[PDB]
Design an enzyme around this catalytic site. Structure first.
Site, PDB file in Angstrom:
ATOM      1  N   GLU A   2      -2.334  -8.965   2.624  1.00  0.00           N
ATOM      2  CA  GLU A   2      -1.865 -10.239   3.179  1.00  0.00           C
ATOM      3  C   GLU A   2      -2.850 -11.367   2.875  1.00  0.00           C
ATOM      4  OE1 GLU A   2       1.092 -10.321   3.868  1.00  0.00           O
ATOM      5  OE2 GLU A   2       1.791  -8.784   5.260  1.00  0.00           O
ATOM      6  N   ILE A   9       0.852  -1.183   0.000  1.00  0.00           N
ATOM      7  CA  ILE A   9       0.000   0.000   0.000  1.00  0.00           C
ATOM      8  C   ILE A   9       0.894   1.242   0.000  1.00  0.00           C
ATOM      9  CG2 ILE A   9      -1.601   1.384   1.377  1.00  0.00           C
ATOM     10  CD1 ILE A   9      -2.958  -1.291   2.189  1.00  0.00           C
ATOM     11  N   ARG A  60      -2.263 -12.440  -0.604  1.00  0.00           N
ATOM     12  CA  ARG A  60      -1.045 -13.252  -0.712  1.00  0.00           C
ATOM     13  C   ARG A  60      -1.199 -14.693  -0.232  1.00  0.00           C
ATOM     14  NH1 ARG A  60       2.342  -8.416   2.099  1.00  0.00           N
ATOM     15  NH2 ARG A  60       2.848  -7.197   0.233  1.00  0.00           N
TER      16      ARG A  60
END
Ligand code: CTN
Ligand code: NAG
Length: 246
Positions: free
Chosen positions: A160, A71, A163
């Site tokens: 996250e 970000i 991911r």
């Protein structure tokens, strides 16, 4: 662009958002069936815009670097906010240029600095969809100490989760009740760069990691990852950081 609305949100709609987020990141190849993020993207195309809406329908737009899912900053009404780091300053040349003012936050975007600013490690910060609603609301009006905590929540519930399938599922379990992240969640977040590297190195080494990656499992026990047959590689990780950027 991708969007997520907290009003009416459930595990299904959150799952759709994370799928959209993943699918918005460009790649030319897969390594062991996992999308390999690009070494570099030029100009405005480097940044993905995420439109996030709190329960009341108020919104922020978050700029995400598509090469690493970092970000960079966000737009709240007519004010842009960027991390105090060179990559985010670069991003400010391309996104949210129509903002009336630009505030540089008094910290960079890495976990260690955000935790210092927030006054607590993210082991102690509850996450979930309610926490994400709070985070969006906090970011609507400037408060740097509050924003650090909000950003820790934001990063984990978007980047996250994109991911790692395990992290997506952890947030889905927290759709209506926040809870601090599992030890395994923290472990995966911390190991994404390492895992991405070893998975790429495993090509040319018969699927074997050049260096083993130590993780905490869903049970709280410390396992060791040595090759691509591991569940973390076959089912969990969804995006690889390019070794060019490691
Ligand atoms: N500008 C930045 C920089 C870092 N990060 C997140 O924090 C982790 C590094 O501690 C990185 O792994 C990344 O997830 C971020 O979201 N934005
Ligand atoms: C590969 O990893 C799996 C799962 O972690 C493990 O059972 C196995 O021993 C490893 N194989 C080799 C050749 O190291």
């Amino acid at each position: 662009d991708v969007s997520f609305r907290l009003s009416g949100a459930d595990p299904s709609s959150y799952g759709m958002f994370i799928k959209d987020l993943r699918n918005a990141l460009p790649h030319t190849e897969k390594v062991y069936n996992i999308p390999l993020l690009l070494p570099s993207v030029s100009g405005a195309g480097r940044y993905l815009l995420m439109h996030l809406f709190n329960y009341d329908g108020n919104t922020i737009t978050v700029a995400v670097d598509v090469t690493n899912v970092y970000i960079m900053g966000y737009l709240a009404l007519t004010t842009s906010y960027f991390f105090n780091e060179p990559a985010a300053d670069l991003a400010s040349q391309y996104v949210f240029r129509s903002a009336r003012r630009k505030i540089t936050l008094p910290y960079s975007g890495n976990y260690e600095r955000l935790q210092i600013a927030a006054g607590k490690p993210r082991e102690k910060i509850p996450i979930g969809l309610p926490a994400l609603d709070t985070a969006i609301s906090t970011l609507l009006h400037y408060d740097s100490t509050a924003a650090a905590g909000a950003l820790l929540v934001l990063i984990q519930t978007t980047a996250e989760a994109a991911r790692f399938k395990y992290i997506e599922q952890q947030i889905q379990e927290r759709a209506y009740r926040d809870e601090v992240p599992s030890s395994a969640t923290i472990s995966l977040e911390n190991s994404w760069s390492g895992l991405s590297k070893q998975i790429q190195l495993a090509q040319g080494n018969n699927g074997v990691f050049r260096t083993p990656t130590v993780l905490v499992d869903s049970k709280g026990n410390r396992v060791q990852i040595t090759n691509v047959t591991s569940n973390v590689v076959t089912s969990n990780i969804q995006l690889l950081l390019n070794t060019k950027n490691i």
